[PDB]
Amino acid sequence: PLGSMPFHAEPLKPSDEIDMDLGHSVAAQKFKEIREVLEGNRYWARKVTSEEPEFMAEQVKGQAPNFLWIGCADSRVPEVTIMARKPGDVFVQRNVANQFKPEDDSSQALLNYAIMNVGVTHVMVVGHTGCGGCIAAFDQPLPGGTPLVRYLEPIIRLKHSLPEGSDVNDLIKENVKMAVKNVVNSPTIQGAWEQARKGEFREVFVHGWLYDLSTGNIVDLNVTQGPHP
Protein backbone atom coordinates (compact mmCIF):
# COMPACT_ATOMS: atom_id res chain seq x y z
CA PRO A 1 0.00 0.00 0.00
CA LEU A 2 0.95 3.60 -0.70
CA GLY A 3 1.43 4.58 2.94
CA SER A 4 -0.75 3.61 5.92
CA MET A 5 -4.04 5.27 4.92
CA PRO A 6 -3.93 5.55 1.13
CA PHE A 7 -7.69 5.18 0.66
CA HIS A 8 -9.02 7.01 3.73
CA ALA A 9 -11.95 9.30 3.00
CA GLU A 10 -12.24 12.72 4.58
CA PRO A 11 -15.72 14.12 5.29
CA LEU A 12 -16.80 17.03 3.14
CA LYS A 13 -16.14 20.36 4.78
CA PRO A 14 -19.04 21.62 6.92
CA SER A 15 -19.32 24.77 4.84
CA ASP A 16 -19.75 22.69 1.69
CA GLU A 17 -22.31 20.48 3.31
CA ILE A 18 -24.25 23.46 4.58
CA ASP A 19 -24.18 25.16 1.19
CA MET A 20 -25.64 22.09 -0.35
CA ASP A 21 -28.25 21.82 2.40
CA LEU A 22 -29.32 25.38 1.77
CA GLY A 23 -29.70 24.77 -1.95
CA HIS A 24 -33.32 24.07 -1.27
CA SER A 25 -33.81 27.71 -0.31
CA VAL A 26 -34.52 30.16 -3.25
CA ALA A 27 -34.19 33.15 -0.95
CA ALA A 28 -30.86 31.99 0.50
CA GLN A 29 -29.47 32.18 -3.01
CA LYS A 30 -30.76 35.72 -3.43
CA PHE A 31 -30.03 37.39 -0.09
CA LYS A 32 -26.71 37.06 1.64
CA GLU A 33 -28.44 38.11 4.91
CA ILE A 34 -30.84 35.19 4.62
CA ARG A 35 -28.10 32.72 3.80
CA GLU A 36 -26.25 34.02 6.90
CA VAL A 37 -29.06 33.40 9.35
CA LEU A 38 -29.77 29.94 7.86
CA GLU A 39 -26.11 29.07 8.07
CA GLY A 40 -26.19 30.13 11.71
CA ASN A 41 -28.94 27.70 12.29
CA ARG A 42 -27.25 24.84 10.47
CA TYR A 43 -24.04 25.23 12.49
CA TRP A 44 -26.12 25.33 15.68
CA ALA A 45 -28.12 22.28 14.66
CA ARG A 46 -25.00 20.31 13.75
CA LYS A 47 -23.41 21.08 17.11
CA VAL A 48 -26.43 20.32 19.30
CA THR A 49 -27.34 17.13 17.58
CA SER A 50 -23.82 15.83 17.70
CA GLU A 51 -23.21 16.92 21.32
CA GLU A 52 -26.67 16.70 22.94
CA PRO A 53 -28.86 14.26 20.97
CA GLU A 54 -30.63 13.14 24.13
CA PHE A 55 -31.76 16.67 24.64
CA MET A 56 -33.05 17.02 21.08
CA ALA A 57 -34.97 13.77 21.31
CA GLU A 58 -36.56 14.87 24.58
CA GLN A 59 -37.68 18.08 22.96
CA VAL A 60 -39.42 16.15 20.12
CA LYS A 61 -41.67 14.45 22.65
CA GLY A 62 -43.31 17.52 24.12
CA GLN A 63 -42.89 20.56 26.34
CA ALA A 64 -43.49 21.26 30.00
CA PRO A 65 -42.19 24.80 30.69
CA ASN A 66 -42.86 26.24 34.12
CA PHE A 67 -42.86 29.85 32.91
CA LEU A 68 -44.78 32.11 30.62
CA TRP A 69 -42.83 35.21 29.53
CA ILE A 70 -44.94 38.19 28.37
CA GLY A 71 -42.34 40.47 26.88
CA CYS A 72 -41.54 43.04 24.23
CA ALA A 73 -40.81 42.34 20.58
CA ASP A 74 -37.62 44.40 20.89
CA SER A 75 -34.74 42.54 19.33
CA ARG A 76 -32.54 43.19 22.35
CA VAL A 77 -34.67 41.09 24.68
CA PRO A 78 -34.52 37.39 23.70
CA GLU A 79 -35.72 35.62 26.81
CA VAL A 80 -33.79 32.33 26.58
CA THR A 81 -30.52 34.09 25.92
CA ILE A 82 -30.70 36.66 28.69
CA MET A 83 -31.82 34.06 31.30
CA ALA A 84 -29.29 31.46 30.04
CA ARG A 85 -32.11 28.96 29.54
CA LYS A 86 -32.65 26.17 27.02
CA PRO A 87 -35.38 25.31 24.56
CA GLY A 88 -38.26 23.81 26.62
CA ASP A 89 -38.00 26.17 29.55
CA VAL A 90 -40.06 29.29 28.72
CA PHE A 91 -43.39 29.67 26.88
CA VAL A 92 -43.46 33.11 25.27
CA GLN A 93 -45.69 35.94 24.18
CA ARG A 94 -43.91 38.90 22.60
CA ASN A 95 -45.63 42.01 21.32
CA VAL A 96 -44.93 45.75 21.18
CA ALA A 97 -44.24 47.11 24.65
CA ASN A 98 -45.27 43.93 26.48
CA GLN A 99 -48.98 44.76 26.79
CA PHE A 100 -51.59 42.32 27.95
CA LYS A 101 -54.77 43.98 26.71
CA PRO A 102 -57.96 42.56 28.26
CA GLU A 103 -59.87 42.96 24.98
CA ASP A 104 -57.26 41.05 22.97
CA ASP A 105 -58.77 37.61 22.37
CA SER A 106 -55.49 36.24 21.06
CA SER A 107 -53.65 37.22 24.25
CA GLN A 108 -56.42 35.83 26.41
CA ALA A 109 -56.29 32.58 24.47
CA LEU A 110 -52.54 32.32 24.89
CA LEU A 111 -52.79 32.86 28.66
CA ASN A 112 -55.62 30.37 29.02
CA TYR A 113 -53.73 27.78 27.00
CA ALA A 114 -50.54 28.37 28.95
CA ILE A 115 -52.25 27.81 32.28
CA MET A 116 -54.87 25.22 31.47
CA ASN A 117 -52.99 23.09 28.88
CA VAL A 118 -49.23 23.84 28.80
CA GLY A 119 -49.09 23.78 32.65
CA VAL A 120 -47.11 26.91 33.47
CA THR A 121 -46.91 27.95 37.15
CA HIS A 122 -45.36 31.44 36.83
CA VAL A 123 -46.29 34.25 34.49
CA MET A 124 -43.72 37.03 34.17
CA VAL A 125 -44.42 40.29 32.46
CA VAL A 126 -40.99 41.63 31.50
CA GLY A 127 -40.46 45.20 30.38
CA HIS A 128 -37.08 46.65 29.46
CA THR A 129 -35.19 49.92 29.41
CA GLY A 130 -35.02 51.64 26.00
CA CYS A 131 -38.53 50.47 25.12
CA GLY A 132 -39.55 52.28 21.97
CA GLY A 133 -43.28 52.06 22.53
CA CYS A 134 -42.90 53.55 25.96
CA ILE A 135 -40.49 56.25 24.71
CA ALA A 136 -43.01 57.10 22.04
CA ALA A 137 -45.90 57.07 24.49
CA PHE A 138 -44.06 59.35 26.86
CA ASP A 139 -44.41 62.39 24.59
CA GLN A 140 -47.88 61.83 23.12
CA PRO A 141 -51.01 63.80 23.94
CA LEU A 142 -54.00 61.96 25.22
CA PRO A 143 -56.13 60.64 22.39
CA GLY A 144 -54.79 58.48 17.25
CA GLY A 145 -52.88 59.14 14.04
CA THR A 146 -50.86 55.98 13.33
CA PRO A 147 -51.47 52.28 14.09
CA LEU A 148 -48.72 52.56 16.66
CA VAL A 149 -50.18 55.54 18.49
CA ARG A 150 -53.59 53.95 18.59
CA TYR A 151 -52.02 50.74 19.86
CA LEU A 152 -50.16 52.59 22.55
CA GLU A 153 -53.27 54.36 23.91
CA PRO A 154 -53.22 52.52 27.26
CA ILE A 155 -49.56 53.43 27.85
CA ILE A 156 -50.23 57.04 26.86
CA ARG A 157 -53.13 57.19 29.25
CA LEU A 158 -50.93 55.69 32.01
CA LYS A 159 -48.26 58.29 31.33
CA HIS A 160 -50.80 61.08 31.72
CA SER A 161 -51.73 59.62 35.14
CA LEU A 162 -48.20 59.48 36.51
CA PRO A 163 -46.89 62.16 38.78
CA GLU A 164 -44.94 65.16 37.82
CA GLY A 165 -41.31 64.29 37.45
CA SER A 166 -41.81 60.73 36.29
CA ASP A 167 -39.19 59.71 33.73
CA VAL A 168 -39.22 57.20 30.85
CA ASN A 169 -38.09 54.35 33.10
CA ASP A 170 -40.83 55.18 35.54
CA LEU A 171 -43.32 54.75 32.70
CA ILE A 172 -41.70 51.49 31.59
CA LYS A 173 -41.95 50.13 35.13
CA GLU A 174 -45.56 51.27 35.57
CA ASN A 175 -46.37 49.74 32.18
CA VAL A 176 -45.10 46.38 33.51
CA LYS A 177 -47.30 46.78 36.59
CA MET A 178 -50.29 47.66 34.44
CA ALA A 179 -49.85 44.51 32.37
CA VAL A 180 -49.46 42.40 35.52
CA LYS A 181 -52.82 43.81 36.74
CA ASN A 182 -54.45 42.97 33.39
CA VAL A 183 -53.08 39.39 33.60
CA VAL A 184 -54.27 39.06 37.17
CA ASN A 185 -57.75 40.31 36.29
CA SER A 186 -58.10 37.87 33.39
CA PRO A 187 -60.79 35.23 33.56
CA THR A 188 -57.99 32.65 33.31
CA ILE A 189 -56.12 33.76 36.42
CA GLN A 190 -59.18 34.64 38.43
CA GLY A 191 -60.52 31.16 37.63
CA ALA A 192 -57.25 29.40 38.41
CA TRP A 193 -56.96 31.18 41.73
CA GLU A 194 -60.44 30.23 42.80
CA GLN A 195 -59.79 26.62 41.91
CA ALA A 196 -56.50 26.65 43.84
CA ARG A 197 -58.24 28.03 46.90
CA LYS A 198 -60.60 25.04 46.57
CA GLY A 199 -57.60 22.72 46.36
CA GLU A 200 -58.65 21.79 42.85
CA PHE A 201 -55.63 23.28 40.97
CA ARG A 202 -52.03 24.30 41.56
CA GLU A 203 -51.21 27.81 42.70
CA VAL A 204 -50.22 30.07 39.80
CA PHE A 205 -48.33 33.34 40.22
CA VAL A 206 -47.94 36.54 38.24
CA HIS A 207 -44.77 38.65 38.46
CA GLY A 208 -43.45 41.89 37.09
CA TRP A 209 -39.86 42.22 35.97
CA LEU A 210 -37.65 44.79 34.28
CA TYR A 211 -34.69 44.00 32.03
CA ASP A 212 -31.99 46.68 32.40
CA LEU A 213 -30.13 46.87 29.08
CA SER A 214 -27.32 48.89 30.74
CA THR A 215 -26.28 46.01 33.03
CA GLY A 216 -27.90 42.89 31.51
CA ASN A 217 -29.68 42.38 34.80
CA ILE A 218 -33.39 41.46 35.32
CA VAL A 219 -34.80 43.28 38.30
CA ASP A 220 -37.91 42.10 40.14
CA LEU A 221 -40.41 44.95 40.57
CA ASN A 222 -42.02 43.08 43.48
CA VAL A 223 -45.56 43.07 42.30
CA THR A 224 -46.08 39.33 42.53
CA GLN A 225 -49.61 38.00 43.14
CA GLY A 226 -50.98 34.56 43.77
CA PRO A 227 -54.20 32.96 44.95
CA HIS A 228 -53.55 34.09 48.55
CA PRO A 229 -52.20 37.35 49.89
Q: 216: left (phi > 0), else alpha (psi -120 to 50), else beta? A: left
Q: With beta carbons less than 8 A apart as the criterion, state whether 121 and 194 touch.
A: no
Of these residues, 46, 85, 94, 128, which one is catalytic?
Answer: 128
**Nearest approach, Cβ of residue 213 and its own copies (Å):** 5
Using CB under 8 A as the criterion, what x/- string covers residues 105-134 for binding its own copies?
xxxxxx-xxx--xx--xx------xx-xx-
3 state DSSP class of 90: strand
**Residue positions forming the annotated binding site:** 72, 74, 128, 131
- Which of 12, 20, 45, 162 is the binder for its own copies (CB under 8 A)? 45
The one catalytic residue among 35, 46, 131, 228? 131
For residue 76, indicate whether it is catalytic. yes
Nearer to its own copies, 23 or 160 (CB): 23
CA distance 220 to 126: 9
Site string for its own copies, 145-184 (x = CB under 8 A): -xxx-xx---------------------------------
Gap between the Cα atoms of 105 and 146, Å rounded: 22
CA nearest 115: which of 137, 95, 134, 91?
91
